[model samples]
Target: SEQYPVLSGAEPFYAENGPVGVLLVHGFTGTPHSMRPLAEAYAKAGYTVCLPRLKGHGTHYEDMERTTFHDWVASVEEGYGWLKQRCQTIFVTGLSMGGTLTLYLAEHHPDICGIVPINAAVDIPAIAAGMTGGGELPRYLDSIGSDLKNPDVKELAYEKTPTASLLQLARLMAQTKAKLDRIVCPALIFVSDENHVVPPGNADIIFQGISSTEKEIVRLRNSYHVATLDYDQPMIIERSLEFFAKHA
Candidate 1:
């Protein structure tokens, strides 16, 4: 079978519910399975939900190399459009690069009800440092896929990540940081103290940069970078539900 259909369970997930819609974006090189549980949580609580598998993700790392960050954003935009026609009030949240997109969305669309960015990677020094140092590097590296504390579960992520895609990722982060002040919506920022991928200080970067009057940073004690699928997910889900409703 062709990979054109996306990896089996990595397909885009959607659940129709009440008036308020929540769009959850997955991380780079990750599948919809990572965010599916959280989307189900939102749905059970009577909120419409959409969790899109980013373009080139979950299919294969090679597939990822062919697309740019713009393509990934286009995937999210598609999800947003799908949710928009169903609900007037929409909330956006994401993990990692998805978090970057969340910040991008908030900055770009002031009409969004609220935002939640979990373990976001806005000011990752290594990415900037590497870009500045610009040297020949390997095409792929051992996956940064399942960065979680829980030993029992595994995230659906690629075994290798395309270094070429980092260029696109860099551009996305650059755009988020410069225009972060454009975000005026209420925000619920999730911080995982022991994250292995993005530095913990990214939460501070968002907290200090955003123009939102109503914002709060909640810490996740039992999770890592992929907190959406970690032990503290229940708390993340519950808090987010309340966060969106309070602002809605």
Candidate 2:
């Protein structure tokens, strides 16, 4: 199932024999599984895409607990370098924390052709403030089920939250918000209309703050925080592919 051996730690970077390169990075505690559909969409459009398992991700939570944002960023940079080697143009996208990392890349690497973020977070502290009404705090990860549940309202069937990692995420998000205005790539930022993980205001801030002249925002009205796999998933590929085509 592993098409590219570069995914393994021993071989960091390798070749990608394709016309267009799209590098996909997953969120803080997420696996590439979340971005697989997005990658497949680009691949169907004749673009070669690589989804790198961010440092401390795609493994046990304990392993992820040991990774810092710096390590995760380094892994993303390596993927970018590898993809740039074989494709004519390069585009980057991520979900949540990965979005922040891609934003950093777009700012630092001016040559990057395009940038895409799904439910990205900037100034997450501000986002967290409105989680719920003051008195009855919204059931966060630890309290009652995953704040967003399916039909059957269950309690604590699924939950994953490590304070150590969240603290690091807070720091990383602050860094990303401060550097938003410096990115010069053609950008497409996507955000859910009703996301509990990240504030909807973050979408406005990213779209307004980026220096990209040809920027666009894709709003996910029916989806939650993870827009890639949610109801508005098609909009992500449709809008992103159009943007990529223009920049490519």
Candidate 3:
């Protein structure tokens, strides 16, 4: 089920520019390719952008099996630090598990200007619960990437999901959800109507849990789980720019 060249769009992407910086994070098992388009959009708008390839991702699934949630969070911190070196202000946006990590960063770091987490996976599905360690299920499952509305588009992600890493992700979500009230930064959340992966209700959970007084939730009518790469991608980019501009 490998779709494209393994290294085609898997590398980390960085474009240094204006004083405003944006850290774009890809989802679980997904490479920077998933966020490249959106990151480029921000760069074109004169904002410096960094799209970091999460650890154990953009490579073989076996590599991901050896990594954990802490590694993923550390990767994000590294990306944010890289942007911090050049920009006066910083913002963050992510898809799926990346969104979960975004919440983690906003909770721990107060210097962030704002945040946008698209179709974030805050609540783990019951079916995936068994994937955690000490479960009776198999070690891997089918790929969850490329859940897009556009028939022709696909995300370059792992062909199989490593259950060991999934366990870590589940733990990360639980830990992040508990600290939701700590995230008070301006947030612009995007929830799609027909996500094949994370449930749409998770958006409500985030909206109600976070302490951010300046938060807005936009519902997408034509996208799926990977909304950043879906039909509504333009809306996400344009609206995010407006959101950032308003806060700036």
Consecutive 10-residue window with the lowest summed lDDT within model 2: 149-158
Candidate 3 lDDT, tens digit per residue, 124-237? 677355664344867888864478888889778888988678778888999898999999999999999998789999999999999999999999999888888788989999
- In model 1, where do residues sit more than 4 Å from their true spots? 1-3
> What TM-score, to 2 decimals, does candidate 2 have?
0.82
Off by over 4 Å in 3: 1-6, 132-135
Off by over 4 Å in 2: 1-17, 126-159
List model 1 lDDT by residue over 19-124, tens digit each.
8999999988888888888898889989899998788887778889899988999889998889889998999989888888999888877579999999888887
Candidate closer to the true structure by lDDT (higher is better), 1 or 3:
3
Q: Candidate 2: lDDT of 111?
A: 81
Clashing pairs in 1: none
Q: Which ten residues in a row have the lowest lDDT in candidate 1?
A: 1-10
Can you list the residue pairs that collide in candidate 2? none
Model 2: how far residue 170 lies from native, Å: 1.3
Residue 39 lDDT in candidate 3: 94
Question: lDDT of model 2 at residue 178?
Answer: 86
Model 3 steric clash total? 0
Q: Once model 2 is optimally superposed onto the true structure by TM-score, how far is the C-alpha of residue 89 displaced, in angstroms?
A: 0.6
